[PDB]
Design a protein around this ligand. Structure first.
Ligand code: CL
Length: 175
């Protein structure tokens, strides 16, 4: 019944996660930044901040009322945001369904009193953190494309020199 640090996210198939870390190790030396663990690669829909058990339940219920078709993500884009010090993977033209889902979840969080960054939703998958220096970003690998069937509520913790994301609940997207 202690508060947890939560976020909604979309996950990647194992095969694609593996292609990504192989591609990453090939193009980015350790000095380019701190690599996100393969299992920790995800696309965040909405950050909720620290959330009480009571508030988690309310947000989970609102998430469960979402009615949306599934969509396809094709990762054709890669870049670097120096100020936020990340190297990221993303999509040039995200499907509307992704935008709809994120905005819906973000709206629900906001209306519940959740911490607001007032940052415009920029769908991305963080590959490197603490990326300070400016490196050369290659295009992604070929055919990193898959159907999104669901989204998940995660808890975030740190154990044994690792970041850990714990799945709490999942909701399927219709199709
Ligand atoms: Cl371009």
């Amino acid at each position: 019944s202690e508060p947890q640090r939560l976020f909604f996210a979309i996950d990647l198939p194992a095969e694609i996660r593996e292609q990504i870390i192989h591609w990453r190790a090939k193009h980015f030396p350790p000095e380019a930044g701190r690599p996100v663990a393969a299992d920790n690669l995800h696309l965040t829909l909405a950050f909720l901040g620290e959330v009480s058990a009571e508030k988690e339940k309310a947000l989970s219920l609102l998430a469960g009322r979402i009615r949306q078709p599934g969509f396809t993500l094709t990762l054709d884009d890669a870049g670097q945001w120096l100020r936020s010090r990340v190297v990221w993977l993303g999509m040039r033209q995200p499907p509307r369904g992704l935008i709809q889902l994120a905005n819906m979840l973000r709206s629900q969080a906001a209306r519940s009193g959740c911490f607001q960054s007032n940052r415009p939703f920029h769908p991305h998958i963080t590959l490197l953190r603490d990326a300070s220096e400016a490196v050369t970003i290659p295009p992604p690998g070929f055919n990193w494309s898959y159907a999104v069937t669901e989204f998940t509520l995660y808890a975030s913790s740190f154990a044994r020199g690792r970041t850990r994301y714990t799945p709490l609940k999942r909701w399927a997207l219709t199709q």
